[PDB]
C-alpha cells in the first residue's frame, strides 16, 4: 500500500541518537527504520497508520533543527 | 516531489549484501540503491529508477534469488 511516511535527513550520528530517542520517548508512529543512506549524511524513515497519526506526530514530537523533515509516501 | 518508481528487495541481510554488491555491477539498469536497512536479520534494499521503462529492464536482466522477496512500488521524493 502507498504508506504515509516522513524521512528525517541529517548527520548519521544525530540520526542514530534521534532514532533511540524516538523509540524510547515518543508515540504517534507505526515503525521507524534503521539509519540508512543512498559519507556522514543519512536518512531515517518513520511510518504511520494514517494521515491523522502522522499529523499528531508532527504536532508533538520534538525533532532537531539540524534534521530535515520530509513528508511523503512510499509503497510497503 | 514526484512519485518515483522503485522496488524493495527484502531478505536475509547476507543475501542482500551480496546481491547489492553484485548489482553495483549493472548500475546501468537503476538510478540509485540504498544501503541495507530494517524496521526497528530481515533487511531491505531500496532501488530507484528514473522511469518504469528502466525498471522493467532491470527486472528483465537481473537475477534475484527466491528467498529475496521483490516488492514493486513507488515512493515520493
Curated annotation (Swiss-Prot), chain A:
Q: Where is this cross-link: Glycyl lysine isopeptide (Lys-Gly) (interchain with G-Cter in SUMO)?
A: 9
Report residue spans for region: DNA-binding domain: 3-76
Q: How is the polypeptide modified once translated? A: Phosphorylated.
Q: Where in the cell is it found?
A: Host nucleus
Write out the function statement from the record: Plays a role in the initiation of viral DNA replication. A dimer of E2 interacts with a dimer of E1 in order to improve specificity of E1 DNA binding activity. Once the complex recognizes and binds DNA at specific sites, the E2 dimer is removed from DNA. E2 also regulates viral transcription through binding to the E2RE response element (5'-ACCNNNNNNGGT-3') present in multiple copies in the regulatory regions of the viral genome. Activates or represses transcription depending on E2RE's position with regards to proximal promoter elements including the TATA-box.
The family line of this record is: Belongs to the papillomaviridae E2 protein family.
Quaternary organization: Binds DNA as homodimer. Interacts with protein E1; this interaction greatly increases E1 DNA-binding activity. Interacts with protein L1; this interaction enhances E2-dependent replication and transcription activation. Interacts with protein L2; this interaction inhibits E2 transcriptional activity but not DNA replication function E2. Interacts with protein E7; this interaction inhibits E7 oncogenic activity. Interacts with host TAF1; this interaction modulates E2-dependent transcriptional regulation. Interacts with host BRD4; this interaction mediates E2 transcriptional activation function.
Under what name is this protein listed?
Regulatory protein E2
Organism of origin is Human papillomavirus type 18
Shown part of the complete sequence: 287 to 365 of 365
Amino acid at each position: 500500500h502507498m504508506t504515509p511516511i516522513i524521512h528525517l535527513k541529517g548527520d548519521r550520528n544525530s540520526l542514530k541518537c534521534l532514532r533511540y530517542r524516538l523509540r524510547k520517548h515518543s508515540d504517534h508512529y507505526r515503525d521507524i527504520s534503521s539509519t540508512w543512506h543512498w559519507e556522514k549524511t543519512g536518512i531515517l524513515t518513520v511510518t504511520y497508520h494514517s494521515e491523522t497519526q502522522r499529523t499528531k506526530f508532527l504536532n508533538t514530537v520534538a525533532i532537531p533543527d539540524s534534521v530535515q523533515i520530509l513528508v511523503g509516501y512510499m509503497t510497503m
